[PDB]
Every structure is written in structure tokens, then in C-alpha cells.
Amino acid sequence: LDAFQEIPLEEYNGERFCYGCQGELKDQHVYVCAVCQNVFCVDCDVFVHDSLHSCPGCI
């Protein structure tokens, strides 16, 4: 894993779930933050905006 990609579920062959839900990436894409733990959901890119930080994992 490297810089942010939305990887098709098809290609990825890898870590399945976003760290935030401890739930699954699966709705459409695979997301990564190489910066931080590096796997996301679509819920998860949004996760931060009110409740957290600019990114979730980054702290």
C-alpha cells in the first residue's frame, strides 16, 4: 500500500475492512491511507469531518 487509491475490490486481494468501523470496505471501493493504517471505506473518508480530524487515522 502506497498513496491514496480507490482500488477496485476486484484487484485488491487484501485487507478487507476499514479500520474505523472495524467493518468492511466492500460498498464500492477499497481505500487506503498509507499515511495512516492504510485501509478505508467509503463511510470512512467522510468519518472525520465533524467528529475528528482532517483524516481519521492520521493522529
Tell me which residues touch Zn ion (CB under 5 A). 18, 20-21, 33, 35-36, 41, 43-44, 55, 57-58
CB 16, min distance to Zn ion, A? 11
CB 27, min distance to Zn ion, A? 9
CB 40, min distance to Zn ion, A? 7
**Cα angle 50-51-54, degrees, rounded to a multiple of 5:** 70
d(Cα 6, Cα 13) in Å, to the nearest integer? 13
d(Cα 47, Cα 1) in Å, to the nearest integer? 21
Nearer to Zn ion, 8 or 35 (CB): 35
